[PDB]
Design a protein around this ligand. Structure first.
Ligand SMILES: *C/C=C(C)/C=C/C=C(C)/C=C/C1=C(C)CCCC1(C)C
Ligand SMILES: CCCCCCCCCCCCCCCC
Ligand SMILES: CCCCCCCCCCCCCC
Ligand SMILES: CCCCCCCCC
Ligand SMILES: CCCCCCCCC
Ligand SMILES: CCCCCC
Ligand SMILES: CCCCCC
Length: 264
């Protein structure tokens, strides 16, 4: 079970969560349109980094819309508060989105990093492997967020071990391949790494909400952190990857990338 199913919610708490999720759908699909449009101004060897953002926007947007539908269908406003009608709302569908979107977010980083060939394939394999372990162990720990907080923290500790290893591999490859990047994007890519580390750390914090704020307000706070983390890790992060791909495109002489930057 999950802590969401434990509480009734005031109209203010319930509708705030609903608007957070609905706004998340709108923001992800709004970025989707932008990424599709701007991808033509990216050189062919970087265009797959922009395509990966489109895939992330589609899958993140569809699953956020599924959760807003489940949120509305699970509770009804009875006797002055929103009460659970159906055992249907699960944050586990976020975990399947994460397993879908995390590899795409990692791959588009490696591409603008100018990883190629054997090093690109092998690095992607280990990063996806480390992400798989982080998601599966975290998903099992999330099963005990109501019944046994101790198991939530023990599985979260193992999941964090995968998280630290994944970031070490990413930081290692950035430090090693920064110099190959054009147009000053070698400076930009490590700030993207800092944003990635800040944004991805918001997820384990929301994961631990049942352990330090197990009430209706903690449920609101958790969806708030997820909303901030999604927009940061997918939309803002994707905009920076796209800027890097366009900047390196223009630096290599790709003409339509140069007009796009001339407008700003
Ligand atoms: C768009 C969604 C993204 C980038 C999700 C990222 C998720 C994580 C970095 C998850 C991290 C976790 C741990 C490090 C420990 C506790 C369990 C997890 C799975 C929440
Ligand atoms: C040419 C670069 C392609 C990069 C794609 C790498 C895919 C490697 C797949 C590794 C298998 C990991 C299985 C974990 C998923 C459950
Ligand atoms: C690129 C170098 C980044 C180094 C960051 C080190 C942060 C260490 C984390 C300590 C725990 C913080 C938990 C919020
Ligand atoms: C937990 C953050 C790991 C950062 C790795 C940096 C490695 C650079 C050589
Ligand atoms: C309640 C509005 C949430 C918007 C979060 C945006 C985060 C950007 C860093
Ligand atoms: C840059 C080579 C294409 C990447 C395929 C995932
Ligand atoms: C070069 C791929 C990194 C290996 C991680 C174990």
């Amino acid at each position: 079970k999950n802590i969401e199913s434990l509480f009734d919610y005031s109209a203010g708490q319930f509708e705030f969560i609903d608007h957070l999720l609905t706004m998340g759908v709108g923001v992800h699909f709004a970025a989707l349109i932008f990424f599709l449009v701007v991808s033509q101004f990216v050189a062919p060897k970087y265009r797959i980094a922009t395509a990966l953002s489109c895939i992330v926007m589609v899958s993140a947007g569809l699953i956020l819309n599924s959760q807003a539908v489940m949120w509305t269908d699970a509770y009804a406003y009875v006797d002055g508060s929103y009460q659970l009608q159906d055992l249907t709302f699960s944050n586990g569908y976020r975990y399947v989105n994460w397993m879908a979107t995390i590899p795409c977010l990692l791959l588009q980083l490696l591409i603008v990093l100018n990883l190629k060939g054997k090093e690109l394939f092998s690095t992607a394999t280990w990063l996806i492997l480390a992400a798989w372990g982080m998601i599966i162990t975290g998903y099992v720990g999330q099963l005990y967020e109501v019944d046994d907080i101790a198991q939530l923290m023990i599985w979260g500790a193992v999941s964090t071990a995968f998280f630290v290893v994944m970031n070490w591999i990413v930081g290692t490859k950035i430090f090693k391949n920064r110099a190959t990047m054009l147009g000053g994007t070698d400076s930009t890519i490590t700030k993207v790494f800092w944003l990635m580390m800040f944004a991805w750390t918001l997820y384990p914090i929301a994961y631990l909400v049942p352990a330090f704020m197990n009430n209706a307000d903690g449920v609101v706070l958790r969806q708030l952190l997820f909303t901030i983390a999604d927009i940061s890790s997918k939309v803002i992060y994707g905009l920076m990857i796209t800027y890097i791909a366009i900047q390196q495109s223009a630096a290599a002489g790709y003409v339509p990338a140069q007009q796009a930057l001339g407008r700003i």
